[PDB]
Structure formats: structure tokens, C-alpha cells
């Protein structure tokens, strides 16, 4: 019964990790040549 809550804690850490991984978008890089 209590297994729902232990599962909630490992799952909470994994889902927070997943959403913070989905947040980042990085700027493109332009290279000039001469």
C-alpha cells in the first residue's frame, strides 16, 4: 500500500530529471572565414 509512496519518490526524482532535461535549448554558432 506504502509502495505507492516509495514509488512516488523514485519516480518524482526521475520525472524532475526528465523535465529539466527537456528544458534547455542552446544558441547556434556562426563561423566566419577569410
Amino acid at each position: 500500500q506504502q509502495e505507492i509512496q516509495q514509488r512516488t519518490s523514485d519516480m518524482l526524482t526521475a520525472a524532475t530529471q526528465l523535465v529539466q532535461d527537456w528544458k534547455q535549448v542552446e544558441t547556434q554558432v556562426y563561423t566566419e572565414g577569410t
Binding site: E26, Q28, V29, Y30, T31, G33, T34
Partner: protein
């Protein structure tokens, strides 16, 4: 006196706890473990070289490049004639997933994929062009593009087979014939025979011929079922089947 030997035996067992055969089996375990760790899942990608034509029409689709993680793919840019076209600039989206090496003047890019399945795009500006060329880059397929040759529509700042047969490379599209009685090879390409040998052909007469520095000859000729040859002063005959 047996006290000394018994102490010597427990002594030996304390000093070297592992047998030699145990050392051999542990080494085998370790190498098998390394092989299982180093093995690749599924099938590894197929190594391919490709060549595409890039269309700058407002209806066409941008070209696709297949990559792989940790491997190097070379992109070389050529014009409509096929001469190299040096690169003016480039613009890469998502640099955390892809790595680009480029000396600042040439026409060759070196791309390494960093992530497994993350795909992106790139913009390339050439020296003479006003139109930039845009490419898309996807890793992780069932084939990996080792090198792509690109034909561009415009014009850049820059605008035989007997050599390959002498080298031993068969002409493309040919089929093999069987030659008996001596050291020669033959192919049929365009209803013409091509012969690679170190004999001297005397009778049927050739159209073009080349020789290397150590004496191998390559001949281009029309098809015929007989050759008369003399090896260093001796005349004999060759018969060609197929």
C-alpha cells in the same frame, strides 16, 4: 623437522593465495567481460560512400546526411563541373550534439556526432555564391554516410580507363572472360576486349597501349577469339572463352 615443512606449506598458501590456473581462468573471465562490455547491440551500421545533387529550387527538399556517434564524416563541396568549391562560412545549430572541425579556407568539413539519436541542421555559404546551401544531419541509421560528394548547380571559382586496367582494377560494368595458357587477364566492356598482361601480343594488332615502369602492358582492342603471342622469342597461341 615436519614442523618446518608444514609451516612452509601454510606459508606458501598464505603468500600466493591464487593458483596459476586460477590466474589463467580469471584472465579469461576479464577478457570475456571486456568483450561483452565492448560489444555493440543490434547490427553495426553499414559503411557507405555516397554522392548527391543539390537542387536550389523552391520546391525541392534539403539533403540528408547519415551520421554515427564518435565517427568522422567528411563533406566535400563541388560545383556542376565537379571542381572543388571553397567554403566562405558556416552556421551550426545545436553544437552540444555535433562537433565540426574545419580549417578556415578549405572545402572539406569534418563532422563527429556526439549524441545518439539527436538530429539537427547546418547552413553553409560558399565563396562565390549568394545562395546559401542548407543541410540536415541525422545520426543513428542502418547505414552510416562516411563521405558525401555534393554537386552544386552553379559555377565555382574553378571551371583514363587503361590506367585502371593496368593497375588491375576492372573497368566498371564489365564481365570476366576465361583465358588459358599464360599470364593474362581480360574483360569485355563495350563489345571491346581489354587485356592486362606481361606478354607481347604480335598478330591481331592493337588500337591503344600502355606500359608501366616495370613492364606490365595494358591493351584496348575489338573482340576476337584468338591471339598469337611470342614470349621472349617463342611463338605460341592463346584461346579465349567466356
Amino acid at each position: 623437522e615436519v614442523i618446518d615443512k608444514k609451516a612452509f606449506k601454510d606459508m606458501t598458501r598464505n603468500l600466493y593465495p591464487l593458483n596459476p590456473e586460477q590466474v589463467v581462468k580469471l584472465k579469461q573471465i576479464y577478457e570475456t567481460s571486456e568483450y561483452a562490455k565492448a560489444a555493440t547491440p543490434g547490427t553495426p551500421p553499414k559503411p557507405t560512400a555516397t554522392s548527391q545533387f543539390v537542387n536550389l529550387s523552391p520546391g525541392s527538399t534539403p539533403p540528408v546526411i547519415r551520421l554515427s556517434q564518435g565517427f568522422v564524416s567528411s563533406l566535400v563541396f563541388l560545383d556542376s563541373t565537379g571542381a572543388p568549391w571553397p567554403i566562405a562560412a558556416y552556421d551550426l545549430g545545436d553544437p552540444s550534439s555535433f562537433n565540426i572541425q574545419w580549417d578556415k579556407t578549405s572545402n572539406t568539413l569534418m563532422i563527429q556526432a556526439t549524441k545518439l539519436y539527436n538530429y539537427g541542421n547546418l547552413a553553409v555559404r560558399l565563396r562565390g555564391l549568394n545562395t546559401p546551401v542548407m543541410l540536415t544531419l541525422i545520426p543513428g541509421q542502418k547505414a552510416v554516410d562516411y563521405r558525401v560528394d555534393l554537386r552544386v548547380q552553379g559555377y565555382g571559382p574553378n571551371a583514363d580507363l587503361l590506367l585502371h586496367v593496368l593497375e588491375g582494377v576492372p573497368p566498371p560494368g564489365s564481365r570476366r572472360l576465361v583465358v588459358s595458357g599464360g599470364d593474362a587477364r581480360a574483360w569485355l566492356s563495350n563489345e571491346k576486349m581489354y587485356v592486362r598482361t606481361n606478354l607481347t601480343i604480335l598478330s591481331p594488332g592493337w588500337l591503344a597501349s600502355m606500359t608501366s615502369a616495370d613492364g606490365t602492358h595494358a591493351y584496348e582492342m575489338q573482340k576476337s577469339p584468338v591471339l598469337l603471342v611470342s614470349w621472349h622469342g617463342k611463338v605460341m597461341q592463346l584461346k579465349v572463352e567466356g
